[PDB]
Ligand binder design. Structure first.
Ligand SMILES: Nc1nc2c(ncn2[C@@H]2O[C@H](COP(=O)(O)OP(=O)(O)O)[C@@H](O)[C@H]2O)c(=O)[nH]1
Ligand SMILES: Nc1nc2c(ncn2[C@@H]2O[C@H](COP(=O)(O)OP(=O)(O)O)[C@@H](O)[C@H]2O)c(=O)[nH]1
Ligand SMILES: Nc1nc2c(ncn2[C@@H]2O[C@H](COP(=O)(O)OP(=O)(O)O)[C@@H](O)[C@H]2O)c(=O)[nH]1
Lengths: 137, 137, 137, 137, 137, 137
């Protein structure tokens, strides 16, 4: 019952990559435990990126992640956290390999189309912050 | 502007068809105004299929629609209601033509994989019943 | 329960369409009850097209059907016979509609890429002719 | 032998549909006899839509067709003209059936993603107008 | 004329991955020399896994590989043996890279969807054991 | 505005891979700045391969690259040159990884389906040689 948090960023949404991306996770055999379209608020954004509150790129993050609606979801399955990270590819598309989501769909780090939890703790932290308990199935 | 209600029934979600179906609507050019995985409550199911509360197939109709989680969504675009109706194909998969969602994915009427609002009127009602106002973007 | 006979003719196999066509039937929800690559013997071809043994196009009809290996299979499911007929599209690719196998892959009647049993009766006969009983699962 | 003129209009190219549409024609079995990305000149657009020079929608019709680059091509094969017409679907995306190019990708008549010669006569004229003789292979 | 033996395991079959998997090998350009749906018998299973007859996981192998019908095939082409191994990805899906068959479709080692010959000798050994001479084309 | 030169070789063209290949670059987010079907002349071929004029494989190159029409194009985007090289995969298909173009579509070095500029200089050199200034958009 391991699980991870994934977010198709605003760029992934306006480019129409929601279905294709979900399709990869479904054919992979992972379970969709949660899923919803949403608009991240400024305050919520700054919270998710709380640790980087001091970083210089922080403003740019909050601005982009709230530039439009996003699709949040939770996937379940064996080693899903490390597995989804592997499927997504390197954070910067130029280093992501063909076959991965960022390697096949993205070209810039600022708009790398997607995000996945780095660790199980980060997953819990992120799941609690974007989903109400009744939204997990 | 125009909006329609779409639902990938429990079989569609069970069979891992959520992404492929979503992708079709995105490729068509429609916008995802709302989206979420949810378990239909016995109450919600009854208020939805109230039309057939007298029919003898109502018990099973409801049982099925709540047998597993579903994916509700709202599509927005030029005549999105009739277009989605056409894209899903006839209700009974036997009459649905290839290239159509039911015609490509469904095999029996009991499990026709998907539902789309029948008219503008049904759209407003169905959307208000499955979605809280704040969930529409 | 219900079963139909399907054959990806020599052109379909030559053109590397076996997988794509198979995938369509699996996505539709049908079950593969039998499957095999085989070279049609002059005898088998004659017993299959016995109907047109008098016609002047029979010689070429047979020559072609044995010009290369083919993929015979048996699909099983709710009204699989008529459904497969619909999925293949009209015999003459000119009349076949897009989304249909012949409508998407074929260009001429001589090479219509695929054949599917016309009726339950044809299904039983064709299956018994192309398949040894132990090959059905 | 037979040849038809096809054009992925500015919206199709803008939306990144060139490859998917091309792939459909290749899977169908047609041959690419000519292909090129090009910006339609105001002159070329007028000579193409001369038919509607009187209509009041002509100004916008031309403006749009030159609003961005397009992909012109020539398909060759057995009755390629009528087949391509069928594959594109009705002009008005509302009437186009799923599995059809316009039926799967277009949403409005203004931007119907693609154009294909209406008859053999239109084909010859359109090809000669969009292509220099040496460009046909 | 080098060749290898491939088997889409029971899990690959019930999940409907037969077509998609074959499609990858066809678009790759390999030739399908043999292909058939079959039910592996207990004795046959134990033979294929003869070497591991002493291993502890042996019982689990025979049990799973006979849990349902499988699709056996033979592919031909330049360095096809090492190539198909590369396409399949690491034996354990968690180590297989995105783009490979196991990396895109599997999550557990016990049900890694597919098998390919490790060496040419293993190929011959496996081809002789699952195919009759007349089944190779 | 960085850009690279790509050529789908004769084998890629006759195998019908033009659309699929373009589709990968479009979903990647790169821009098609130039595109056209063409027949490379002997002299032109020898020029593009000028440096290898002394090599032993030179004759084989000119012969194959002129064996049929090819599709030339120019792609624009962030680090597109190194990125397209990465997408294409190793020059010899046997070393190209699954997910890349050569790794998924090719089996032999002589017919590795595609070519991309090795450096920016090579891109300019190749763009000038295959496209007239008015063909770049
Ligand atoms: N299996 C089955 N379901 C039926 C039958 N008649 C009606 N239904 C169900 O009743 C519902 C009809 O309501 P409707 O809003 O039209 O649903 P739609 O099929 O999505 O258009 C659908 O969920 C049907 O599947 C029947 O004869 N057999
Ligand atoms: N090329 C061509 N084939 C024909 C013609 N008339 C009949 N046939 C062939 O005869 C066979 C008719 O038998 P049938 O069992 O109906 O095959 P089906 O096309 O798979 O339904 C098919 O293989 C046809 O392709 C014709 O006028 N031209
Ligand atoms: N938006 C819009 N376009 C129209 C209308 N009537 C004609 N047209 C355009 O006029 C052209 C008709 O020429 P035609 O050669 O038939 O183009 P086709 O749509 O590719 O078959 C098409 O580009 C149409 O989109 C209309 O009522 N609305």
């Amino acid at each position: 019952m391991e699980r991870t948090f994934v977010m198709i960023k605003p760029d992934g949404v306006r480019r129409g990559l929601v279905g294709e991306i979900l399709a990869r996770f479904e054919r992979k055999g992972f379970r969709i435990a949660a899923l919803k379209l949403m608009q991240i608020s400024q305050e919520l954004a700054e919270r998710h990126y709380a640790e980087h509150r001091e970083k210089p790129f922080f403003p740019g993050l909050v601005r982009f992640i709230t530039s439009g609606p996003v699709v949040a979801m939770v996937l379940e399955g064996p080693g899903v956290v490390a597995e989804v990270r592997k499927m997504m590819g390197a954070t910067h598309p130029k280093d992501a390999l063909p076959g991965t989501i960022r390697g096949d769909f993205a070209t810039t780090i600022d708009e790398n189309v997607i995000h996945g939890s780095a660790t199980l703790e980060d997953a819990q932290r992120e799941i609690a912050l974007f989903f109400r308990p009744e939204e997990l199935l």
